[PDB]
Amino acid sequence: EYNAPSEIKYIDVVNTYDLEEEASKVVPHGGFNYIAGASGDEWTKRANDRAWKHKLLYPRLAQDVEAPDTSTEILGHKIKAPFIMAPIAAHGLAHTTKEAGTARAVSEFGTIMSISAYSGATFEEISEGLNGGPRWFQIYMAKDDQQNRDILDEAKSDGATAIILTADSTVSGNRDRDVKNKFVYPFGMPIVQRYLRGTAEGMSLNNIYGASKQKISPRDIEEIAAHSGLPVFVKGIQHPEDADMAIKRGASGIWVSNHGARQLYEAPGSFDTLPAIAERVNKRVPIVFDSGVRRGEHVAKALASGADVVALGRPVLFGLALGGWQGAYSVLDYFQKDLTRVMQLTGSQNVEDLKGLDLFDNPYGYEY
Amino acid sequence: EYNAPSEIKYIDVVNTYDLEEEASKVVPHGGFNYIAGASGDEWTKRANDRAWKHKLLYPRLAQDVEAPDTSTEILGHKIKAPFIMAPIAAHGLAHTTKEAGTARAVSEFGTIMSISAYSGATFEEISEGLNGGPRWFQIYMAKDDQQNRDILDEAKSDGATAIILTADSTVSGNRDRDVKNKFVYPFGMPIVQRYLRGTAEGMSLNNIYGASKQKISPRDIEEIAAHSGLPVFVKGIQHPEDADMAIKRGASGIWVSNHGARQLYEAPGSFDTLPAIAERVNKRVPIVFDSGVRRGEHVAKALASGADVVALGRPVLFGLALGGWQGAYSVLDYFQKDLTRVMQLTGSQNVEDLKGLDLFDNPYGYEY
Ligand SMILES: Cc1cc2nc3c(=O)[nH]c(=O)nc-3n(C[C@H](O)[C@H](O)[C@H](O)COP(=O)(O)O)c2cc1C
Ligand SMILES: Cc1cc2nc3c(=O)[nH]c(=O)nc-3n(C[C@H](O)[C@H](O)[C@H](O)COP(=O)(O)O)c2cc1C
């Protein structure tokens, strides 16, 4: 009973904020609000966005720069721009082509697709979209150790070159939109088919987050690392002590995130947590940053603040919310062009130069 | 004319500070004061030392650590401990075995030897002491481009795997001890003789530095890197902007140093400059730190603050004075054992763990 959009077209992206309102006049109310919403009254989602005004870019003059190069390398992948696709469940809420549609955009653009444990697409559907493109697999710890062995084997057979252990979701955030809407996922998770015992449709949202491992410990990071023989990112980190713990427990990367503000409420905007984590990590492993990236300036500010790449989420999905629809390859291309402008105006010839930018401290915050 | 010590023996190093007074009993007065002294009234040499009290280590308990590993890697060299030998002129002022004695200690210990352009030993004599051990060559640039190509070609043919461009000595520091003692070198410098016309023997350091290039520019960093095809460190950096510049001009490493306080007077202690430089470098290239390292705690604090390795200077030369290669070796062994203790008490199993340490800010400074 779910009428997702199915039209395929390029979009002229002026900015990613307008993509949210664009789509809701076939684009189902409950699924839109599942994608767009966040915990509580969404103050921490607003914080993710307003945090970018805390540290401001300087234009830099006569820097001897032209035709900036956005390419970078992470864990042996050369990628077209320093952004990857974040792992997101249930892309079928946004478009009938679901994760296969996103994978084709990501692969055709030339970056890394992160595949959610809660994908609505089969791997063979996602694989058809990827057409050999690089992919990382995101897992939740299962209570059942055999389920963890089986899903790590699945990801490795499926050509994953890293595992993303999302650790910030041991229970659901207080997602008021989903509660008020009495939102139920309308389709299955053909990858985690080994846990929910009864039915997937008969479980709303509280019973599925509950279904996964709550008692994750550093030993789980050690055991994923040992079993997989792949680099493991720990995703959801906001406190520097968790970054040190994760690296000591064998993580190969730190993924700074608050899950798009969909988890803990009345927490900091994700960008505000990044410098303290980067200083603690002190180059030991690569850092991925997400939660609120909407502009080229945000990609630059994350790199200047210690991230190696950012991950994109909601703007890429925007095949849905509020008005008439937009989000895909056009969105990836927008971010690459947007970043190229920012590189030219900050004196940055290449992605390494972005990592050396000094930012202006704005103590007044958003209202200035 | 100059009766340097010649005895070869191991020494029991309680601390490296006591080596200074002990070396003053065996090294002729002029040469001793050339090694020990610094600019002006030595306030910035004292600052180098007192800066270590600005950021204090925490003991950490129940950290599940035993038998810490001090090994690390820099620019594809596995080394026994995260310290290398700093390039120091004229080792024959300390011991008759001169740079060959230092080279033997460094290669026997298992780290990298840095060769001063103002060595009193030939590449051949140093090569014999190294017995295949890794070496980096420190250039004091000639004004003549062809002499630079020749020096660089000789160093690379001798087996250099990096070039160190020392840029902080375009003129001498105000070294009052050497002025008062009317210090002149008592022997020749075979590597740079080509541009001294005569011999370094009987020359002041003013006149030797005066022969090297004053008008060093970013183009010089580019041209050394292009000609050598070796990674180039820029040495003497204390301001983060020079780090950004050096990297944009093709440096493969930043070497944070104030030359052991022998150059600009009434400048900060070197360790106080490190964090700002590390934050600006932001992982782009490796950082070597020097100027005042005397204890294992100093090695740990440098790594915690963004350095990949430190370079050792005066203490090693004082060891050479007191025991030739075995005395110099005794000092390197002291630093390795000293660091191992500090790793155990800080909860550090390996060198990467040291990079993740938080330090206590001491705003009272030395007198507390
Ligand atoms: C609709 C939606 C579903 C998500 N599902 C997952 C998930 O399955 N796995 C996961 O690790 N994170 C998940 N996240 C979090 C994202 O990986 C990412 O952290 C977030 O989208 C970044 O915030 P932004 O999209 O507002 O920039 C989801 C986020 C959204 C918006
Ligand atoms: C006696 C002496 C001679 C030095 N000669 C050189 C030199 O030839 N080349 C160079 O790059 N630095 C030279 N330096 C600086 C060292 O590389 C290094 O920065 C310094 O020894 C670090 O300070 P510390 O020994 O007090 O810890 C010299 C230092 C000393 C003590």
Side-chain angles (χ1 to χ4, degrees), chain B residues 150-218:
Chain B
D150 290 349
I151 291 162
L152 286 181
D153 289 346
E154 283 166 36
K156 184 168 189 200
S157 165
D158 174 75
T161 47
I163 301 302
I164 307 153
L165 174 61
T166 303
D168 64 3
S169 298
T170 54
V171 291
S172 186
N174 52 314
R175 301 190 196 179
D176 288 21
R177 297 202 205 185
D178 292 346
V179 175
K180 289 175 175 184
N181 294 328
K182 301 186 186 292
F183 181 71
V184 296
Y185 295 102
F187 48 67
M189 290 174 178
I191 302 174
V192 289
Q193 190 275 156
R194 72 195 66 217
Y195 67 68
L196 294 182
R197 260 155 278 270
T199 170
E201 193 171 0
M203 300 190 71
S204 73
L205 173 56
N206 293 333
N207 286 334
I208 299 191
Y209 273 157
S212 308
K213 189 169 192 162
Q214 283 63 63
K215 207 179 176 169
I216 299 176
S217 69

Coordinates of all heavy atoms in Angstrom, one line a residue, chain B residues 150-218:
Chain B
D150 N 74.7 19.1 -7.4 CA 75.8 18.2 -7.1 C 75.7 17.6 -5.7 O 75.9 16.4 -5.5 CB 77.2 18.9 -7.3 CG 77.6 19.3 -8.7 OD1 76.9 18.7 -9.6 OD2 78.5 20.0 -8.9
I151 N 75.4 18.5 -4.7 CA 75.3 18.1 -3.2 C 74.2 17.0 -3.1 O 74.4 16.0 -2.5 CB 75.1 19.3 -2.3 CG1 76.3 20.2 -2.3 CG2 74.6 18.8 -0.9 CD1 76.1 21.6 -1.7
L152 N 73.0 17.3 -3.7 CA 71.8 16.5 -3.7 C 72.1 15.1 -4.4 O 71.8 14.1 -3.9 CB 70.7 17.2 -4.4 CG 70.1 18.4 -3.6 CD1 68.9 19.0 -4.4 CD2 69.5 17.9 -2.2
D153 N 72.8 15.2 -5.5 CA 73.2 14.0 -6.3 C 74.1 13.1 -5.4 O 73.9 11.9 -5.4 CB 73.8 14.3 -7.6 CG 72.9 14.9 -8.6 OD1 71.7 14.8 -8.5 OD2 73.4 15.4 -9.7
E154 N 75.1 13.7 -4.8 CA 76.1 13.0 -3.9 C 75.3 12.3 -2.8 O 75.5 11.1 -2.5 CB 77.1 13.9 -3.3 CG 78.2 14.3 -4.3 CD 79.1 15.4 -3.9 OE1 79.4 15.5 -2.7 OE2 79.5 16.2 -4.9
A155 N 74.4 13.1 -2.1 CA 73.6 12.5 -1.0 C 72.8 11.3 -1.4 O 72.8 10.3 -0.7 CB 72.8 13.6 -0.4
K156 N 72.0 11.5 -2.5 CA 71.2 10.4 -3.0 C 72.0 9.2 -3.4 O 71.6 8.1 -3.1 CB 70.3 11.0 -4.2 CG 69.4 10.0 -4.7 CD 68.4 10.6 -5.6 CE 67.2 9.7 -6.0 NZ 66.6 10.1 -7.2
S157 N 73.2 9.4 -4.1 CA 74.1 8.3 -4.5 C 74.6 7.6 -3.2 O 74.8 6.4 -3.2 CB 75.2 8.8 -5.4 OG 76.3 7.9 -5.4
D158 N 74.8 8.4 -2.1 CA 75.3 7.8 -0.8 C 74.1 7.1 -0.1 O 74.4 6.3 0.8 CB 75.8 8.9 0.1 CG 76.1 8.4 1.6 OD1 77.2 7.7 1.7 OD2 75.3 8.6 2.5
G159 N 72.9 7.2 -0.6 CA 71.8 6.4 -0.1 C 70.7 7.2 0.7 O 69.9 6.6 1.4
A160 N 70.7 8.6 0.6 CA 69.7 9.4 1.3 C 68.3 9.0 0.8 O 68.1 8.9 -0.4 CB 70.0 10.8 1.1
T161 N 67.4 8.9 1.8 CA 66.0 8.6 1.4 C 65.1 9.8 1.8 O 63.9 9.7 1.6 CB 65.5 7.3 2.1 OG1 66.0 7.3 3.4 CG2 66.1 6.1 1.3
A162 N 65.6 10.9 2.2 CA 64.9 12.2 2.4 C 65.9 13.3 2.4 O 67.1 13.1 2.7 CB 64.0 12.2 3.6
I163 N 65.5 14.5 2.1 CA 66.3 15.7 2.1 C 65.6 16.6 3.2 O 64.4 16.8 3.2 CB 66.4 16.4 0.8 CG1 66.9 15.5 -0.3 CG2 67.1 17.7 0.9 CD1 68.3 15.0 0.0
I164 N 66.5 17.2 4.0 CA 66.1 18.2 5.1 C 66.6 19.6 4.7 O 67.8 19.8 4.7 CB 66.6 17.8 6.5 CG1 66.3 16.3 6.9 CG2 66.1 18.8 7.5 CD1 67.3 15.8 7.8
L165 N 65.7 20.4 4.2 CA 66.0 21.8 3.9 C 65.9 22.6 5.2 O 64.9 22.9 5.7 CB 65.1 22.4 2.9 CG 65.4 23.9 2.6 CD1 66.8 24.2 2.1 CD2 64.4 24.4 1.6
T166 N 67.1 22.9 5.8 CA 67.1 23.8 7.0 C 67.0 25.2 6.6 O 68.0 25.7 5.9 CB 68.4 23.5 7.9 OG1 68.3 22.2 8.2 CG2 68.4 24.4 9.1
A167 N 66.0 25.9 6.9 CA 65.7 27.3 6.4 C 65.8 28.3 7.4 O 65.6 29.5 7.1 CB 64.5 27.3 5.6
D168 N 66.2 28.0 8.7 CA 66.1 28.9 9.8 C 67.5 29.5 10.1 O 67.6 30.1 11.2 CB 65.4 28.3 11.0 CG 66.2 27.1 11.6 OD1 67.4 26.8 11.1 OD2 65.8 26.6 12.6
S169 N 68.4 29.4 9.3 CA 69.8 29.7 9.6 C 70.4 30.5 8.4 O 71.6 30.4 8.2 CB 70.7 28.5 9.8 OG 70.1 27.8 10.9
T170 N 69.6 31.4 7.8 CA 70.1 32.2 6.6 C 71.2 33.2 7.1 O 72.1 33.5 6.3 CB 68.9 32.9 5.9 OG1 68.1 33.6 6.8 CG2 68.1 31.9 5.1
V171 N 71.1 33.6 8.4 CA 72.3 34.2 9.2 C 72.3 33.5 10.5 O 71.3 32.9 10.9 CB 72.1 35.7 9.3 CG1 72.3 36.4 8.0 CG2 70.8 36.1 10.0
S172 N 73.5 33.6 11.2 CA 73.7 33.0 12.5 C 72.8 33.7 13.6 O 72.6 34.9 13.5 CB 75.1 33.2 12.9 OG 75.4 32.5 14.2
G173 N 72.4 32.9 14.5 CA 71.9 33.5 15.8 C 73.0 34.2 16.5 O 74.2 34.1 16.2
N174 N 72.6 35.0 17.5 CA 73.5 35.9 18.3 C 74.0 35.0 19.4 O 73.5 35.0 20.5 CB 72.8 37.1 18.8 CG 71.4 36.9 19.4 OD1 70.6 36.1 18.9 ND2 71.2 37.5 20.6
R175 N 75.0 34.1 19.1 CA 75.5 33.1 20.0 C 76.6 33.7 20.9 O 77.8 33.6 20.6 CB 76.0 31.9 19.2 CG 74.9 31.3 18.4 CD 75.3 30.0 17.8 NE 74.4 29.7 16.8 CZ 74.5 28.6 16.0 NH1 75.4 27.7 16.3 NH2 73.6 28.3 15.1
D176 N 76.3 34.3 22.0 CA 77.2 35.1 22.8 C 78.4 34.2 23.3 O 79.5 34.8 23.4 CB 76.6 35.7 24.1 CG 75.6 36.8 23.9 OD1 75.1 36.9 22.8 OD2 75.4 37.6 24.8
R177 N 78.2 33.0 23.6 CA 79.3 32.2 24.1 C 80.4 32.1 23.0 O 81.6 32.2 23.4 CB 78.9 30.7 24.4 CG 77.9 30.6 25.6 CD 78.0 29.2 26.2 NE 76.7 28.8 26.8 CZ 76.5 27.7 27.5 NH1 77.6 26.8 27.7 NH2 75.4 27.4 28.0
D178 N 80.0 31.9 21.8 CA 81.0 31.7 20.6 C 81.6 33.0 20.3 O 82.8 33.0 20.0 CB 80.2 31.2 19.4 CG 79.7 29.8 19.6 OD1 80.1 29.1 20.5 OD2 78.9 29.4 18.7
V179 N 80.9 34.1 20.5 CA 81.5 35.5 20.3 C 82.6 35.7 21.4 O 83.7 36.0 21.0 CB 80.4 36.6 20.3 CG1 81.1 38.0 20.2 CG2 79.4 36.4 19.1
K180 N 82.2 35.5 22.7 CA 83.1 35.7 23.8 C 84.4 34.8 23.7 O 85.5 35.2 24.0 CB 82.4 35.5 25.1 CG 81.4 36.6 25.4 CD 80.5 36.5 26.6 CE 79.7 37.7 26.9 NZ 78.9 37.7 28.1
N181 N 84.2 33.5 23.2 CA 85.3 32.5 23.0 C 86.1 32.7 21.7 O 87.1 31.9 21.5 CB 84.7 31.1 23.2 CG 84.2 30.8 24.5 OD1 84.6 31.4 25.5 ND2 83.2 30.0 24.6
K182 N 85.6 33.6 20.8 CA 86.1 33.7 19.5 C 86.2 32.4 18.8 O 87.3 32.0 18.3 CB 87.5 34.4 19.5 CG 87.5 35.8 20.2 CD 88.8 36.6 20.1 CE 88.8 37.9 20.9 NZ 87.9 38.9 20.2
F183 N 85.2 31.6 18.9 CA 85.1 30.2 18.4 C 85.3 30.2 16.9 O 84.5 30.9 16.1 CB 83.8 29.5 18.8 CG 83.8 28.1 18.3 CD1 84.6 27.2 18.9 CD2 83.1 27.8 17.1 CE1 84.7 25.9 18.4 CE2 83.1 26.5 16.7 CZ 83.9 25.5 17.3
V184 N 86.2 29.4 16.4 CA 86.4 29.0 15.0 C 86.4 27.5 14.9 O 86.9 26.8 15.8 CB 87.6 29.6 14.3 CG1 87.4 31.2 14.3 CG2 88.9 29.2 14.9
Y185 N 85.9 26.9 13.8 CA 86.0 25.4 13.6 C 87.5 25.0 13.5 O 88.3 25.7 12.8 CB 85.3 25.0 12.3 CG 83.8 25.2 12.5 CD1 83.1 26.2 11.9 CD2 83.0 24.3 13.2 CE1 81.8 26.4 12.0 CE2 81.7 24.5 13.4 CZ 81.0 25.5 12.8 OH 79.7 25.7 12.9
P186 N 87.9 24.0 14.2 CA 89.3 23.5 14.1 C 89.6 22.5 13.0 O 90.7 21.9 13.1 CB 89.5 22.9 15.5 CG 88.2 22.2 15.8 CD 87.2 23.2 15.1
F187 N 88.7 22.2 12.1 CA 88.9 21.2 11.0 C 87.9 21.6 9.9 O 87.0 22.5 10.1 CB 88.6 19.8 11.5 CG 87.4 19.6 12.3 CD1 86.1 19.8 11.8 CD2 87.4 19.3 13.7 CE1 85.0 19.7 12.6 CE2 86.3 19.2 14.5 CZ 85.1 19.4 13.9
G188 N 88.1 21.0 8.8 CA 87.4 21.2 7.5 C 86.0 20.5 7.5 O 85.8 19.6 8.4
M189 N 85.2 21.0 6.6 CA 83.8 20.5 6.3 C 83.8 20.0 4.9 O 83.5 20.8 4.0 CB 82.8 21.5 6.5 CG 82.6 21.9 8.0 SD 81.4 23.3 8.1 CE 81.3 23.5 9.9
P190 N 84.1 18.7 4.6 CA 84.3 18.2 3.2 C 83.0 18.3 2.3 O 83.2 18.4 1.1 CB 84.7 16.8 3.4 CG 84.3 16.4 4.8 CD 84.4 17.7 5.6
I191 N 81.8 18.4 2.8 CA 80.6 18.3 2.0 C 80.4 19.7 1.4 O 79.9 19.8 0.2 CB 79.4 17.8 2.7 CG1 79.6 16.4 3.2 CG2 78.2 17.9 1.8 CD1 78.5 15.8 4.1
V192 N 80.7 20.8 2.1 CA 80.3 22.2 1.7 C 81.6 22.9 1.2 O 81.4 24.1 0.8 CB 79.5 23.0 2.8 CG1 78.1 22.4 2.9 CG2 80.3 23.0 4.1
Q193 N 82.8 22.4 1.4 CA 84.1 23.0 1.1 C 84.0 23.7 -0.3 O 84.5 24.8 -0.5 CB 85.1 21.9 1.1 CG 86.6 22.4 1.0 CD 87.0 22.6 -0.4 OE1 87.9 23.4 -0.7 NE2 86.4 21.8 -1.3
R194 N 83.2 23.1 -1.3 CA 83.1 23.5 -2.7 C 82.6 25.0 -2.7 O 83.0 25.6 -3.8 CB 82.0 22.7 -3.4 CG 80.6 23.0 -3.0 CD 79.6 21.9 -3.5 NE 79.9 20.6 -2.9 CZ 79.9 19.4 -3.4 NH1 79.6 19.3 -4.7 NH2 80.2 18.3 -2.7
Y195 N 81.9 25.5 -1.7 CA 81.4 26.9 -1.8 C 82.0 27.8 -0.7 O 81.5 28.9 -0.6 CB 79.9 26.9 -1.9 CG 79.0 26.4 -0.8 CD1 78.9 27.1 0.4 CD2 78.2 25.3 -0.9 CE1 78.1 26.7 1.5 CE2 77.3 24.9 0.1 CZ 77.2 25.6 1.3 OH 76.4 25.2 2.3
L196 N 83.0 27.3 0.0 CA 83.7 28.1 1.1 C 85.0 28.7 0.5 O 85.4 29.8 1.1 CB 84.0 27.2 2.3 CG 82.7 26.7 3.0 CD1 83.1 25.8 4.2 CD2 81.8 27.8 3.4
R197 N 85.5 28.2 -0.6 CA 86.8 28.7 -1.2 C 87.8 28.9 -0.1 O 87.9 30.0 0.4 CB 86.5 29.9 -2.1 CG 86.3 29.6 -3.6 CD 85.5 30.6 -4.3 NE 84.0 30.4 -4.1 CZ 83.3 29.6 -5.0 NH1 83.8 29.0 -6.0 NH2 82.0 29.5 -4.7
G198 N 88.6 27.8 0.2 CA 89.7 27.8 1.2 C 89.5 26.6 2.1 O 90.4 25.6 1.9
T199 N 88.6 26.5 3.0 CA 88.3 25.5 4.0 C 87.6 26.1 5.2 O 87.9 27.2 5.6 CB 89.6 24.8 4.5 OG1 89.3 24.0 5.6 CG2 90.7 25.8 5.0
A200 N 86.6 25.3 5.7 CA 85.8 25.7 7.0 C 86.8 25.8 8.2 O 86.5 26.5 9.2 CB 84.8 24.7 7.3
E201 N 88.0 25.2 8.1 CA 89.0 25.3 9.1 C 89.5 26.7 9.3 O 89.9 27.4 8.4 CB 90.2 24.4 8.8 CG 91.2 24.2 9.9 CD 92.3 23.1 9.6 OE1 92.2 22.5 8.5 OE2 93.1 22.8 10.5
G202 N 89.4 27.2 10.6 CA 89.8 28.6 11.0 C 88.7 29.6 10.7 O 88.9 30.8 11.0
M203 N 87.5 29.2 10.1 CA 86.4 30.1 9.9 C 85.4 30.1 11.0 O 85.2 29.0 11.7 CB 85.6 29.6 8.6 CG 86.5 29.6 7.3 SD 85.5 29.4 5.8 CE 84.6 30.9 5.7
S204 N 84.8 31.3 11.2 CA 83.6 31.5 12.1 C 82.4 30.9 11.5 O 82.4 30.7 10.2 CB 83.5 33.0 12.4 OG 83.0 33.7 11.3
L205 N 81.3 30.6 12.2 CA 80.1 30.1 11.7 C 79.3 31.2 10.9 O 78.7 30.9 9.9 CB 79.2 29.5 12.8 CG 77.8 29.1 12.4 CD1 77.8 28.1 11.3 CD2 77.1 28.5 13.6
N206 N 79.4 32.5 11.4 CA 79.0 33.7 10.6 C 79.3 33.5 9.1 O 78.4 33.6 8.3 CB 79.6 35.0 11.2 CG 79.1 35.3 12.5 OD1 78.0 34.9 12.9 ND2 79.9 36.1 13.3
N207 N 80.6 33.3 8.9 CA 81.2 33.3 7.5 C 80.8 32.1 6.7 O 80.6 32.2 5.5 CB 82.7 33.5 7.5 CG 83.2 34.9 7.9 OD1 82.4 35.9 7.6 ND2 84.3 35.1 8.4
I208 N 80.7 30.9 7.4 CA 80.2 29.7 6.8 C 78.7 29.8 6.4 O 78.4 29.6 5.2 CB 80.5 28.4 7.7 CG1 82.0 28.3 7.9 CG2 79.8 27.2 7.1 CD1 82.4 27.0 8.5
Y209 N 77.8 30.1 7.4 CA 76.4 30.5 7.1 C 76.3 31.5 6.0 O 75.3 31.5 5.1 CB 75.6 31.0 8.3 CG 75.0 30.0 9.3 CD1 74.8 30.4 10.6 CD2 74.6 28.8 8.9 CE1 74.2 29.6 11.5 CE2 74.1 27.9 9.8 CZ 73.9 28.3 11.1 OH 73.3 27.5 12.1
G210 N 77.2 32.5 6.0 CA 77.2 33.6 5.0 C 77.4 33.2 3.6 O 76.9 33.8 2.6
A211 N 78.1 32.0 3.4 CA 78.4 31.4 2.1 C 77.2 30.7 1.6 O 76.9 30.7 0.4 CB 79.6 30.5 2.3
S212 N 76.4 30.1 2.5 CA 75.1 29.4 2.1 C 74.1 30.5 1.6 O 74.4 31.7 1.7 CB 74.7 28.5 3.2 OG 75.7 27.6 3.6
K213 N 73.0 30.0 1.1 CA 71.9 30.9 0.5 C 71.1 31.6 1.6 O 70.5 31.0 2.5 CB 71.0 30.1 -0.4 CG 70.0 30.8 -1.2 CD 69.3 30.0 -2.2 CE 68.5 30.7 -3.2 NZ 68.2 29.9 -4.4
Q214 N 71.0 32.9 1.4 CA 70.1 33.8 2.4 C 68.7 33.8 1.8 O 67.8 33.7 2.6 CB 70.7 35.2 2.5 CG 71.8 35.3 3.4 CD 73.1 34.6 3.0 OE1 73.7 34.9 2.0 NE2 73.5 33.6 3.9
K215 N 68.6 34.0 0.5 CA 67.3 34.4 -0.2 C 66.5 33.1 -0.6 O 65.9 33.0 -1.7 CB 67.6 35.3 -1.4 CG 66.4 36.2 -1.7 CD 66.6 37.2 -2.8 CE 65.4 38.0 -3.1 NZ 65.7 39.1 -4.0
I216 N 66.5 32.2 0.4 CA 65.7 31.0 0.2 C 64.2 31.4 0.0 O 63.7 32.3 0.7 CB 65.8 30.1 1.5 CG1 67.2 29.6 1.7 CG2 64.8 28.9 1.4 CD1 67.5 28.8 2.9
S217 N 63.5 30.9 -1.0 CA 62.1 31.1 -1.3 C 61.4 29.8 -1.4 O 62.0 28.7 -1.4 CB 61.9 31.9 -2.5 OG 62.3 31.2 -3.6
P218 N 60.0 29.8 -1.5 CA 59.3 28.5 -1.8 C 59.8 27.8 -3.0 O 59.6 26.6 -3.1 CB 57.9 29.1 -1.9 CG 57.9 30.2 -0.9 CD 59.2 30.9 -1.3

